[PDB]
Amino acid sequence: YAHNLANARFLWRNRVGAEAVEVRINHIRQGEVARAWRFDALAIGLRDFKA
Amino acid sequence: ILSTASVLAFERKLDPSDALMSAGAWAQRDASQEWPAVTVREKSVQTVDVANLPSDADTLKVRFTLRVLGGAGTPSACNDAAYRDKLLQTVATYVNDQGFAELARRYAHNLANARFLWRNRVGAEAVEVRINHIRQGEVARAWRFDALAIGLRDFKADAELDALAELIASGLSGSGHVLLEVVAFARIGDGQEVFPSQELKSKTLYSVRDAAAIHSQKIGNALRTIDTWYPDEDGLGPIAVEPYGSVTSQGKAYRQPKQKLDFYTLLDNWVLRDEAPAVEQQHYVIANLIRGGVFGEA
Amino acid sequence: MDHYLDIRLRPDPEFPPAQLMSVLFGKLHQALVAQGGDRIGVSFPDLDESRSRLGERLRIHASADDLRALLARPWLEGLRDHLQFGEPAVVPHPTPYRQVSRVQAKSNPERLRRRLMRRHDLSEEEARKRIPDTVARALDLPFVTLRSQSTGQHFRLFIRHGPLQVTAEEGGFTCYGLSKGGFVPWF
Numbered sequence: 001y002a003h004n005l006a007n008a009r010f011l012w013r014n015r016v017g018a019e020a021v022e023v024r025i026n027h028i029r030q031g032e033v034a035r036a037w038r039f040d041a042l043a044i045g046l047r048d049f050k051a
Numbered sequence: 052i053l054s055t056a057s058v059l060a061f062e063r064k065l066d067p068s069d070a071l072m073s074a075g076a077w078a079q080r081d082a083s084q085e086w087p088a089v090t091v092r093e094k095s096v097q098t099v100d101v102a103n104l105p106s107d108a109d110t111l112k113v114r115f116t117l118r119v120l121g122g123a124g125t126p127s128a129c130n131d132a133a134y135r136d137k138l139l140q141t142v143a144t145y146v147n148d149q150g151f152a153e154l155a156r157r158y159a160h161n162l163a164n165a166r167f168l169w170r171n172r173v174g175a176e177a178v179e180v181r182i183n184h185i186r187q188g189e190v191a192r193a194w195r196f197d198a199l200a201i202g203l204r205d206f207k208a209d210a211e212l213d214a215l216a217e218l219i220a221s222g223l224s225g226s227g228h229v230l231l232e233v234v235a236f237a238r239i240g241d242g243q244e245v246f247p248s249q250e251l252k253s254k255t256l257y258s259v260r261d262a263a264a265i266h267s268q269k270i271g272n273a274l275r276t277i278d279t280w281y282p283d284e285d286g287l288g289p290i291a292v293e294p295y296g297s298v299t300s301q302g303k304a305y306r307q308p309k310q311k312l313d314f315y316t317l318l319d320n321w322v323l324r325d326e327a328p329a330v331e332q333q334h335y336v337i338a339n340l341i342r343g344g345v346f347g348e349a
Numbered sequence: 350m351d352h353y354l355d356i357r358l359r360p361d362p363e364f365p366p367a368q369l370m371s372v373l374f375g376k377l378h379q380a381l382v383a384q385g386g387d388r389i390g391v392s393f394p395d396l397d398e399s400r401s402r403l404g405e406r407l408r409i410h411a412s413a414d415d416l417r418a419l420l421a422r423p424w425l426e427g428l429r430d431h432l433q434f435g436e437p438a439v440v441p442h443p444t445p446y447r448q449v450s451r452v453q454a455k456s457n458p459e460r461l462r463r464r465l466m467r468r469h470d471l472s473e474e475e476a477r478k479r480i481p482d483t484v485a486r487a488l489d490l491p492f493v494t495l496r497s498q499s500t501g502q503h504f505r506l507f508i509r510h511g512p513l514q515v516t517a518e519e520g521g522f523t524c525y526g527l528s529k530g531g532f533v534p535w536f
Contacts, residue, residue: 013062017066173427174372176424176427177427178427202429243496244496273363288361300362300363
């Protein structure tokens with residue numbers, strides 16, 4: 001579930017020929033961000049679920 | 052039995068953008084930054100929409116962005132998995148025989164001359180096309196072509212014409228991203244009336260935001276005009292690659308289904324009876340694969 | 350006048366042949382203004398009068414020296430896609446001669462009403478009752494739609510072939526190639 005949040009698979013056909021895709025994932029506790037997660041979708045493939 | 056799948060949708064590669072227009076003057080095109088755009092205005096003749104350049108302008112400023120994605124052999128919506136598989140290796144052998152060499156060269160011819168200016172090239176005595184290859188946000192390599200040298204009937208050969216061949220074919224094979232920005236400059240005349248894409252006040256001219264523009268599918272049809280293997284009689288020129296070879300200008304559809312040269316039978320013959328068509332005939336088949344369609348058994 | 354040049358419209362899978370020759374007829378009109386001279390004639394070999402069809406072939410009649418400057422003018426650039434040109438060969442000796450004329454039409458009742466406002470100072474109702482809307486002229490003759498640099502209004506220019514005679518008359522030619530008293534060979 002984190003990998004599917006990591007790569008922009010929810011961009012179904014908005015990423016099929018995209019040069020570079022970046023995904024930002026924040027965490028909200030009291031209306032303010034606590035921990036910020038930044039990934040790069042091109043490195044994370046849609047077929048491999050690595051660590 | 053390897054029968055044809057009921058749904059055989061293919062994605063559209065070679066994505067064109069909405070080609071906006073703007074007006075400017077010749078010998079000033081080096082400063083291609085801030086020309087004002089031609090706005091659609093209302094005039095009474097019955098009232099119809101008309102598009103005109105200002106007095107101090109004689110050239111067009113068509114801008115659009117082109118993307119080459121690749122993987123044209125992969126169907127997005129295929130009913131049968133085994134029939135999907137056969138189309139994958141059938142086009143894979145086509146890549147091995149030629150690495151999209153002829154298709155990209157004829158795709159380069161469409162991107163070289165301003166045939167996508169349908170009405171704005173016929174009445175123009177001087178046309179220039181600027182091509183930029185944007186990678187990572189910067190122009191990796193630029194081009195400056197002329198539509199006059201490269202005719203729309205004959206397909207000649209040039210060193211700079213071959214420069215676009217390896218760029219497009221690498222993208223179509225699926226080896227990387229190709230982003231091309233195409234800028235055109237055609238001397239249609241001082242204040243000459245232009246025919247853009249028309250919407251549906253009996254007639255409405257298309258615009259995106261206070262600026263006349265050309266539809267994405269309008270640019271694509273001229274870029275698919277490479278089909279010369281149809282039964283050309285009466286001296287007809289290249290036609291757009293369409294299923295059942297249909298052209299609505301003459302009102303007649305070439306590549307008739309009664310013979311063995313349409314897109315449907317040639318693709319069916321290649322993957323079901325498993326005898327390959329001619330090299331010239333199979334150049335037209337994958338040309339329909341790249342553009343996509345709503346193909347499939349009904 | 351003795352030499353003729355044949356132009357046939359290469360068919361277009363994107364434009365009808367009617368739209369192609371309207372570009373061709375507008376481009377040849379600009380030839381006569383810039384180059385000059387009143388001795389350039391036009392004709393339509395495939396003019397079918399049954400349905401006022403202009404056809405697919407255009408014929409130009411001029412002298413050898415005038416035709417050399419006609420092809421040398423760079424207006425052929427941008428038109429080589431849609432056309433090919435033969436050679437400036439001579440016309441056959443047994444060719445009967447016919448004349449051509451630009452026959453305009455009074456299609457707009459309102460335009461003539463706007464004309465008489467600045468000459469007789471009549472009212473809007475006075476012009477309406479004097480000139481009704483039935484004065485429009487409908488011509489079942491072939492025509493071309495063009496556009497001019499001086500006036501941006503699109504105009505329909507009817508082209509008509511006259512009766513076929515047995516001899517030619519010495520006369521000039523208009524800027525559109527039509528005859529103001531001249532004659533062209535028919536073959």
